[PDB]
């Protein structure tokens, strides 16, 4: 941590903080989904990278050798100091985009231009064509994240699969990035300086609705990717029990949205005895909660297990040294999974439910950073997953 590496990370973090109020009370002392909704996307990105910075200072305080189980060169480069200090220049970035587009100072350009430009520069900073800017990291992830895409054509490893199940988790983002694709092509008003208020957002809407279930087959794409990698290792292992029953746990996906997204178009067109769909879609759904959770707690963080004397409903070893946090876990990551049954109840009680969806996905990142720490720890004492190393 080079001294004016430390200090750039207090520098970037001084800016966000006093600006991060700024917007608050601009909201509240100065002078609408539309926005929510484009912006949302590019909190979550920052969120989820500065989780991820604290995660890797705890892999290594503990001691898990990140770097063999991620297989990388080993001088890791990118430690905590660094992915915090990425997170702070995005996050001003992020801020300016937003505030400016609260206010209106130039008076010529459009407001339309400042959310492209946002996305615009991010895009660039990773395809940097140049050696500067951590040339040496933005690279590798340019190309694992190809193999992922590729999968089916390409073999499986342990990277390959952890940016996998980070980006199911990360799905909102995805969604939104084709809402704000939709969202200027139809119904956007290119000439209305404001750009905000056509249609009332409402019936023009329909890019978040499901006409053609665009949203509805991109919300599957995350699954699909890894649902295919994971017959993919069937056939390479020929026969195995580990590998399918897993992928069948991501298949469970694909029915839930299905049932739900019909639903939603037979309501739309007067029903016509479409309550019986209603039914299957919620069936459906508990399996799918239930499903991941037994496989989070056993298969993936390894507890429940019969070695443990010492430890009830923990494994033998531990290594994070308090084990208050194990139990705590345990609690949460059901209340996590299970937060839908929530926003059902709560979908009852104008534009309701779109807060609700807001709401929660920030804590979807946050039970993937949770998750992070146990599945590592697993990894690294006793190569739980199918076993790649030896």
Known sequence: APAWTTFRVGLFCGIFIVLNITLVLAAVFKLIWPLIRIYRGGFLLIEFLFLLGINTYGWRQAGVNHVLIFELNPRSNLSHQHLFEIAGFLGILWCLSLLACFFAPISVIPTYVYP??????????????????????????????????????????????????????????????????????????????????????????????????????????????????????????????????????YSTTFFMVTFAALYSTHKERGHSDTMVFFYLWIVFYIISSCYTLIWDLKMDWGLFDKNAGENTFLREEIVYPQKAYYYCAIIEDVILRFAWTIQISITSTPHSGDIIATVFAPLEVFRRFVWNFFRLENEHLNNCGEFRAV
């Open 116 to 249: 492209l430009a946002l996305y615009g520069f991010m895009v660039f900073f990773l395809i940097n064509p140049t050696k500067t800017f951590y040339y040496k990291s933005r690279f590798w992830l340019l190309k694992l994240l190809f193999r992922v895409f590729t999968a089916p054509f390409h073999k499986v490893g342990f990277a390959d699969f952890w940016l996998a199940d980070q980006l199911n988790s990360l799905s909102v983002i995805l969604m939104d990035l084709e809402y704000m694709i939709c969202f200027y092509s139809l119904e956007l008003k290119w000439d209305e300086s404001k750009g905000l208020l056509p249609n009332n957002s409402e019936e023009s809407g329909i890019c978040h609705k499901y006409t053609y279930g665009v949203r509805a087959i991109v919300q599957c794409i995350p699954a699909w990717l890894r649902f295919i990698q994971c017959l993919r290792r069937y056939r390479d292992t020929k026969r195995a029990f580990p590998h399918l029953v897993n992928a069948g746990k």
